[PDB]
Amino acid sequence: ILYSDERLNVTEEPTSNDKTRVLSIQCTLTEAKQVTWRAVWNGGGLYIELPAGPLPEGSKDSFAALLEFAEEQLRADHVFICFPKNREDRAALLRTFSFLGFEIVRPGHPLVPKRPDACFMVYTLE
């Protein structure tokens, strides 16, 4: 099931009556920016994973908007945003998002704890 709203179209891909699920959110260049996003649903919170998307050349107001909509429907709060470290982008990203009151953490895999260089952020009903 996929619906399209104001320049935003999402497709929900559930799996069984348990466990996590997979969802895709596509945002159009409403403000001159179009990117394909990938988000996985984990429990009562939304998860955002950036496999390979244009980090730079994007505003911050757009991100906040998509966050408000998703939270409305899902009615959740625990939203996480994880993206790589291209060059000059994560700085301002936290500068604004910090207005919410999230926590900064880094990924740690049993094989490769730190190396991929992926900034992970986790926030909940503040």
- The DSSP bridge pattern shows strands 119-123 and 103-105 to be antiparallel
Q: Taking the CA of residue 121 as centre, how many other CA atoms within 13 Å lie in the half-sphere pointing to its CB?
A: 20
How do the domains of the chain map onto residue ranges? 1-126
Residue type, position 26, single letter: Q
Q: Which CATH class is domain 1-126?
A: alpha beta
Cα–Cα distance, 71 to 31 (Å, whole number)? 21
Query: Which residues touch 121 (CB under 8 Å, ≥6 apart)?
Result: 80, 81, 82, 94, 97, 102, 103, 104, 105
| Strand ranges inside the chain, DSSP E | 2-4, 8-13, 21-27, 35-42, 45-49, 79-83, 103-105, 119-123
Q: How was this structure determined?
A: NMR
Cα–Cα distance, 90 to 42 (Å, whole number)? 24
